[PDB]
A paper describes a structure:
The penicillin-binding proteins (PBPs) synthesize and remodel the cell wall peptidoglycan, a major component of the bacterial cell wall that gives the cell its shape and rigidity. The overall fold of periplasmic PBP3 is bimodular. The C-terminal module is responsible for the transpeptidase activity but no clear function has been assigned yet to the N-terminal module of the construct.
In order to determine its three-dimensional structure, the PBP388–165 domain was produced and its structure solved. The domain crystallizes in P1 with eight molecules in the asymmetric unit. The structure of the PBP388–165 domain was eventually determined by single anomalous diffraction using a selenomethionine substituted PBP388–165 crystal and refined over data collected on a crystal of the native PBP388–165 protein. The eight molecules in the asymmetric unit are organized in four pairs with, in each pair, 18 N-terminal residues swapping into the paired molecule. Together, residues 88–105 from one molecule and residues 106–165 from the paired molecule form a small globular domain whose tertiary structure, three anti-parallel β-strands flanked by three helices, is homologous to the equivalent domain of P. aeruginosa PBP3. From these results, we conclude that, at the concentration used for crystallization, monomers of PBP388–165 are absent and dimers are predominant in the solution. The structure of the PBP388–165 domain, disordered in PBP3, shows a dimerization of the domain by three dimensional domain swapping that is possible but unlikely in the full length PBP3.
Numbering used by the authors:
A (entry chain A), B (entry chain C): 88 to 165
Amino acid sequence: VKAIWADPKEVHDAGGISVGDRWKALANALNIPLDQLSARINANPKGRFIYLARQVNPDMADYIKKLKLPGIHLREES
Amino acid sequence: VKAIWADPKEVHDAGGISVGDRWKALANALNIPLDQLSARINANPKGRFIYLARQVNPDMADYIKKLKLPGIHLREES
């Protein structure tokens, strides 16, 4: 017989309880169906780096950064 | 002007891209509205321990464990 407990800090550090809304927001912003986005990210689950988009203008890139999605990163190009 | 990349291991470790379906599943398993589950978890995001349920049957507990939700734990009662 078990007790169930939550560690709110851990939920937060994984992106929050509603992080799903933000995954959808990433997909919509990039106009990549969520299923396609997920498939590409999950293809090699132990992988540490797969490109999503390139030459993304700051307006779209800042928006994506502010979603604060776990495992999502940006770098300058050129 | 940026490249956007994913880290598939960080994404998996956080519970995955479709974690939202499973947070909904947790709320259902606990027989509570998702909004109430969200409100309790969001109450203090730096908090480390809140009880979600007590004296939970072995099978229900195993279902919860298999949702693989970040920050959700089981402990044995006595």
